[PDB]
Design a binder for these strands. Structure first.
Lengths: 56, 120, 209, 122, 114
RNA sequence: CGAUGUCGGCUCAUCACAUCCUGGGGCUGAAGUAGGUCCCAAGGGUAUGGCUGUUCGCCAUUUAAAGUGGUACGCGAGCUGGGUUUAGAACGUCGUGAGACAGUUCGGUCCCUAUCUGCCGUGGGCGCUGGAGAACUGAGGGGGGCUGCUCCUAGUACGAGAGGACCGGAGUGGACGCAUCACUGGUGUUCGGGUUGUCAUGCCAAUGGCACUGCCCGGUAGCUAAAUGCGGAAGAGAUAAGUGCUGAAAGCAUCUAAGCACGAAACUUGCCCCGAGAUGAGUUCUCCCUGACCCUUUAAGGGUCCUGAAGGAACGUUGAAGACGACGACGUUGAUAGGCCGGGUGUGUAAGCGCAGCGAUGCGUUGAGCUAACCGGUACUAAUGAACCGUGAGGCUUAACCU
RNA sequence: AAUUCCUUGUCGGGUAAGUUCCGACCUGCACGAAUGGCGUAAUGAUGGCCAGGCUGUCUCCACCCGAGACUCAGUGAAAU
RNA sequence: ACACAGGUGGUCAGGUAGAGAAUACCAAGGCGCUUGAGAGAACUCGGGUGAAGGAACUAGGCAAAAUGGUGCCGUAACUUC
RNA sequence: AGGACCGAACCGACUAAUGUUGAAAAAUUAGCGGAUGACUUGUGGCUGGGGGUGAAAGGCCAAUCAAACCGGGAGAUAGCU
């Protein structure tokens, strides 16, 4: 094992100031309910892109 | 190595995968709709969807076929009676598979699979 | 030097009497239409551009909409530009004809080779394989030492390691011509070409052949 | 095919039945051979029928191969093993009084003119 | 879709050798040898026949006493005159590659009950 | 000396040369074949095995050659551990002995979780002076180079005798680098047949799991080399070593000085590839954007109210592609994948039923039954909406011109 | 030769090349008679050498099947 | 050290395959186990195919592999038998 | 009649690979030696530091050994660090 430097707040700032993994941008809703979902899946009450694919 | 493979390598040994999809197809002819993971729902289409075409003939030359897997009388009670003959003038497309989001409290991919025509 | 854009359409055999099978590759050229010619006083160029578009009109890029609608009427695909001086072709001329090869002995092919992905450093750079016996390990599929002891301490540009193998447009610089048809855009040549029907192929008159 | 330690079979009278390759030669850095190559060969087992002795290093010309050849008339010729005609250590070309089977129709032309008297099938 | 079919049908013969492996034959070639053209004949059993079109190899094995001589002819090629049958045979598994290991009484290759 | 891993081989590098090969010449007791001998030139190239701790060696066989050196006799966080630099001892010799040899032979040990200076690969961001999409120029550079045998030349010229050519023209091999699954093999679990042991399906029937894919077979798509091919072009430009003419230094003489023809495998370009982060951010094809009030010695902006273009992302179906990115094919303005249909191709005559056969098992019905990846057809299943990003004509100065 | 300096002793056998091995030579630097001599047998994880059988050690890899690595969600280390 | 790829005195030790209280797979009886969902790239360990062959590898067939059961026929040198 | 030949249980831990800041404080995978006996194993006892144990290796005697462990002498001593 070897160590020339312990990384400063400013050195680690290049991994804590501009990185991206998510943005939660706008999201999706059906005209029947304002409870938000993601762009391409079926909701728990059976709604999908205007086709209402399973009912219980 | 490997090159083309269209089927999923999934998890665990080949006899596990065999005895999972054998049993899960039994559950599909028992309920006509299943809630499961996206890889499982989409790989369950294999052999079971063309088995509807195999069963459409009601013929004696097919009588010893389609009972190599899922060997519980639940399937042969429907096979060549309604399982097959219920889709015999549609020309293909007997299963539907669509995604439902993520497993509740984690990130595993959830989906559903159905037979396109079912009594409930 | 100018050339034609096309694809491989299959493989054939024509035989000798002495004799062997003689492999003959079958090539078809498409959409060598020309829509731009670049010359006179600016940036040192003298060149011609073929613009090989053939795409389904329902998914054409917004920059390419209205860009061939007066001449060429199809979009997508490689633009391809070739060097040409004093042959006097214009944008109101005629499509490049494969009759270019009517008296040509041999042709030079440049075309997308079969993909291999990462492949391996010994498979790509043909290094000499160290023996996997007497206790030697982790030495069988590697590029070996990447530079010299003590002095440089910086690695040389002469050493090769990782990347992707295949997909290069390569150099296959001598294929002897067998048959041409300018009325059917058809070319037959002796020997193999890079890639397959899912690839692209460029053919030029030969120069080191 | 046809490399160091490879065993070949007899094709000529007073030649040996077990003969072994030690050099392919006939060019720089060669290791494999076919029909019409000349091989540096050792007698590996010596018998009463042979006019040769074990461990004697000689030359022989290939006339049969288990990979085969298509050059003669444009249709493959392939055999059960590999066989070679033994060559004269002093005056070059074959030394046997008879050759077995068809062999090659080259072993009779103006580079083998001592051999035209023999009666192989081609 | 295949758009070179017309160039494959330039070589391919409309008469395709079609009788399955195990038939006993005589095959003829011209040899040419620059300026020495003569009709030469080879005898044996057909061990490979049909069906990949212009790639169909056509393989014959002599099955002679102490001699397993083998030839590949490509019947669509410019170098073959004729193929003719003298005896029938019968196979019902694989493309007859076992005729390298079968000899003598094991080389009888049935007779199609003909 | 408060640890600088060592000899030998493998594997990977880098620079010189007093030149082994190849290329260029001179001398000769150089006919010719060679050889013997000296620089011109470092542009291209430069072994496989045995015995052996070896590099060092002594040998068997090849080759156009088996050149010579440097770098800790380059390369153990890149390899083994034969030799040795861990205890063991052994036999001989020596010490009285505790032990040792200008002693040898034999047994015995070889690390990593790779962080940073670095290199490879890949994505994001800043900028090129509004906001974008797609190609191109080249400030520079790397790659290629050499090379076998045979036939003609040639049994001539020359040579007591033995022997014995130059050159450009062809054939035929081999391969560093590179392309492909064709040729011909192999493999092909995803397609189909034969089969041993066991358990089971209510039983029969014949079917399935499991045992190196349990055993034996073909075979597609594909993979591959154990397969086959192609390529080191001519020219342009100026030279090296060198061949000449005309003619000066040093009035002769001289290829050198002026002048003039001609000069290499190298050099600069051509051949193949790379490249504008080239603060020196280049060109073209083109595409679109024409806001306001309050306030500041105020080309910068600060607050607030309005309005969005070009063109992108998200969302995705997927494969001849691929770690991941990415790359090509596609999202009903639909054949991208699945189902279905038909071709294409492989396997081998199913099960049932009848008959023959003391019966096992066969035969017919029947070229039967089944058929993946290649291809066309068929929308039967499946491929989000306004929202997001990104605008609202773009700095100084010199000049023209309309108010 | 388990001891013949250095020298593959010198010569022959077997090998394509055998400093190891097999047989001889006597002219043994430092063999030699119970801290034994020499032959030898049954036993031997004993020391060394040859040939066949067979074989992915090798030409030269080509490939396939599990179970980890690789990515996430809950929990969450170190040498230095 | 522990809800640990661990250790463990003595007893009953079923059926079927088998030479076997090997290994396999059926009672009686028991289990699918507190990280598991994706991916099946580099990279790792274990296991298993394949042509011609062939030890050419290496100081050294180390390792790796063919062979592997049973009944019968057969069985050399040398020998203190 | 077996200090018989082979070979399971039973005992050993020779060979190759893996693991080597491990799953294991030497374990696993497949071979290999012994296996009615100069064999092996349960229980309670006896042998103790220059003393045991050892058909003998500087081998073994509680994660400690060319003299183990623990309380005191002890702040041994040093032309020395």
């Amino acid at each position: 094992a070897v160590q020339q430097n312990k990384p400063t707040r400013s050195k680690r700032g290049m991994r804590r100031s501009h990185d991206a993994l998510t943005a939660v941008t706008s999201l999706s809703v059906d005209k029947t309910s304002g409870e938000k979902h993601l762009r391409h899946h079926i909701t728990a009450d059976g709604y999908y892109r205007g086709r209402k694919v399973i009912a219980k | 190595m490997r090159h083309r493979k269209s089927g999923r390598q999934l998890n665990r040994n080949s006899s596990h995968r065999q005895a999972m999809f054998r049993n899960m197809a039994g559950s599909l002819v028992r309920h006509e709709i299943i809630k499961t993971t996206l890889p499982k729902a989409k790989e369950l289409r294999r052999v079971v969807e063309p088995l509807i075409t195999l069963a459409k003939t009601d013929s004696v030359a097919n009588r010893r076929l389609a009972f190599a897997r899922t060997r519980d009388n639940e399937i042969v009670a429907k096979l060549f009676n309604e399982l097959g003959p219920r889709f015999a003038s549609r020309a293909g497309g007997y299963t539907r598979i669509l995604k439902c989001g993520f497993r509740a409290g984690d990130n595993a991919p959830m989906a559903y699979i159905e037979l396109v025509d079912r009594s409930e | 030097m100018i050339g034609l854009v096309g694809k491989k359409v299959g493989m054939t055999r024509i035989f000798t009497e002495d004799g062997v099978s003689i492999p003959v590759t079958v090539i078809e050229v498409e959409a060598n239409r020309v829509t731009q010619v670049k010359d006179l006083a600016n940036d040192g160029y003298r060149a011609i551009q073929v613009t090989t578009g053939a795409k389904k009109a329902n998914r054409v890029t917004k920059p390419e909409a209205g860009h061939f609608a007066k001449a060429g009427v199809e979009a997508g695909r490689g633009l391809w530009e070739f060097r040409l001086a004093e042959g006097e072709e214009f944008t109101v001329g005629q499509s490049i004809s494969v009759e270019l090869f009517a008296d040509v002995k041999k042709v030079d092919v440049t075309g997308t080779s079969k993909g291999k992905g990462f492949a391996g450093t010994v498979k790509r750079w043909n290094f000499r394989t160290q023996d996997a016996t007497h206790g030697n390990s982790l030495s069988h599929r590697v590029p070996g030492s990447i530079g010299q002891n003590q002095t440089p301490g910086k690695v040389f540009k002469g050493k090769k390691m990782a990347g992707q193998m295949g997909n290069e447009r390569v150099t296959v610089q001598s294929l002897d011509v067998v048959r041409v048809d300018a009325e059917r855009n058809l070319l037959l040549v002796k020997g193999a070409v890079p890639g397959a029907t899912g690839s692209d192929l460029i053919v030029k008159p030969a120069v080191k052949a | 095919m046809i490399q160091e330690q490879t065993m070949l079979n007899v094709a000529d009278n007073s030649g040996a039945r077990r003969v072994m390759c030690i050099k392919v030669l006939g060019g720089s850095h060669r290791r494999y051979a076919g029909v019409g190559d000349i091989i540096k060969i050792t007698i590996k087992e010596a018998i009463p029928r042979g006019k040769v002795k074990k461990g004697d290093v000689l030359k022989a010309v290939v006339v049969r191969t288990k990979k085969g050849v298509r050059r003669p008339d444009g249709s493959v010729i392939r055999f059960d093993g590999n066989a070679c005609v033994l060559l004269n250590n002093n005056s070059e070309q074959p030394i046997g009084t008879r050759i077995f089977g068809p062999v090659t129709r080259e072993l009779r032309s103006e580079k083998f003119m001592k051999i035209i008297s023999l009666a192989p099938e081609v | 879709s295949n758009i070179i079919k017309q160039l494959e049908q330039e070589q391919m013969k409309q008469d395709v050798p079609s009788f399955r492996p195990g038939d006993t034959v005589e095959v003829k070639v011209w040899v040419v040898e620059g300026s020495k053209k003569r009709l030469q004949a080879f005898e044996g059993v057909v061990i490979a026949i049909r069906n990949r079109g212009l790639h169909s190899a056509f393989t014959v094995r002599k099955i002679s006493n102490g001699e397993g001589v083998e030839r590949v002819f490509q019947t669509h090629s410019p170098v073959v005159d004729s193929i003719s049958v003298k005896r029938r045979g019968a196979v019902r598994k694989a493309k007859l590659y076992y005729l390298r290991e079968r000899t003598g009484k094991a080389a009888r290759i049935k007779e199609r009950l003909n």
